[PDB]
Amino acid sequence: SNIVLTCKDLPIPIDLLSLFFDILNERHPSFDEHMFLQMIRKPDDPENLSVFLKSAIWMLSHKRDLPGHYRLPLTCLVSTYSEYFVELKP
Amino acid sequence: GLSNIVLTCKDLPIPIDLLSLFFDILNERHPSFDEHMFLQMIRKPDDPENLSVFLKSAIWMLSHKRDLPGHYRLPLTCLVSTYSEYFVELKP
User: Fold this and answer.
1) Is there a contact between A57 and B52 if contact means CB atoms under 8 Å apart?
2) Do B69 and B91 meet the contact criterion of CB atoms below 8 Å apart?
3) What angle in degrees, to the nearest 10, is found between the helix axes of A14-27 and A71-82?
4) What domains are defined for chain B?
5) From CA B60, how far away is CA B3, in angstroms rounded?
6) CA-to-CA distance for A40 and A27, rounded, in angstroms?
7) Do A54 and B49 touch (CB under 8 A)?
8) Which secondary structure element, helix H or strand E, spans residue B33, and what is its range?
9) Its quaternary structure (chain A)?
10) Which of residues 17-46 of B touch A (CB under 8 A)?
11) Rounded alpha-carbon distances, angstroms, from residue B47 to B17, B52, B73, B88, B89
12) Theoretical Cys-Cys bridge with A61: which of A24, B52, B77, B88, CB 3.0 to 4.6 Å?
C-alpha cells in the first residue's frame, strides 16, 4: 500500500546530475564544476545552497521535458539538500 | 485551542506562529496567494507553479532572512523538505 524510500541511499543517474549542473551553470555561470561538487559533498554557504535548490525546483515545476524517471531522484535531491538549512544560517 | 495544539511535520512540532509568519511573507511577495490557497497547499499541493512559489518563500526565509527565530529553523526546513516531495507526482 505504501512504500518508504530513504532519499539518502537513492540512486541518482549520472545524466541527471549532469543535466542539473548544465541548467544551474547556464543560469549562474559563476556556479562552476568545483562549487557544484562541494554542494553535493556538503553545502557551506546559504546563498549558494538557495540557488542550487531553486534550479532543481524550476526543473521540477516548469521544465516540461524533464525525463519522468528523473522526477524521483531529483525530488530526493531537493528534500535531502534542503536539510542543511537547519545549521546553515545567513 | 489553536494556541495549545501541537501540529507536527515528520513528528517535529511546527510552531503556529511560524505558519502565520510564512503565510505573511509569502502573501506580501505574492498578494494573490491568499489564505485559501495557502491552506490548500498545506493539505495537498495541486499546482506545480503554486508549490514552487510556496517553497521559494520558505527557502528565502532560511537563506536570506537574518531575524528568523532560531527555533524556527528546524520546523521550517522540515516543511521545505516535506512539501518538496509532492513534485514526484505533481508535473508541469
Assistant:
1) yes
2) no
3) 60
4) 1-92 (1.20.1440.190)
5) 26
6) 18
7) no
8) none
9) Homodimer.
10) none
11) 25, 9, 26, 12, 11
12) B52
Q: Experimental method used, please?
A: X-ray
* Chain B residues inside the 8 Å CB shell of A60: 48, 52, 87
Note whether A82 contacts B84, CB cutoff 8 Å: yes
Cross-chain Cβ contact A49/B66 below 8 Å: no
The residues that bridge with B57 in the sheet, in sequence order, are none
A10 lies within 8 A of chain B by CB: no
- The helix (run of H) or strand (run of E) holding residue B80 is helix B73-83
User: What whole-number distance in Å separates Cα of residue B44 and Cα of residue B51?
Assistant: 10
- What is the spatial distance between Cα A4 and Cα A26, in angstroms, rounded to a whole number? 34
**A59 in Cβ contact with A74 (< 8 Å):** yes
Enter the C-alpha cell of residue A82.
534542503
CA angle (B15 as vertex; B10, B17 as ends), nearest 5: 140
With contacts defined as CB-CB under 8 Å, which chain A residues touch B87? 57, 60-61, 71, 74-75, 78
Q: Are A45 and A38 in contact (CB under 8 A)?
A: no
Tell me whether strands B8-9 and B12-13 are parallel, antiparallel or unpaired.
Answer: antiparallel
Q: Which residue of B has its CA nearest to A5?
A: B85
Instruction: State this model's resolution in angstroms.
Output: 2.0
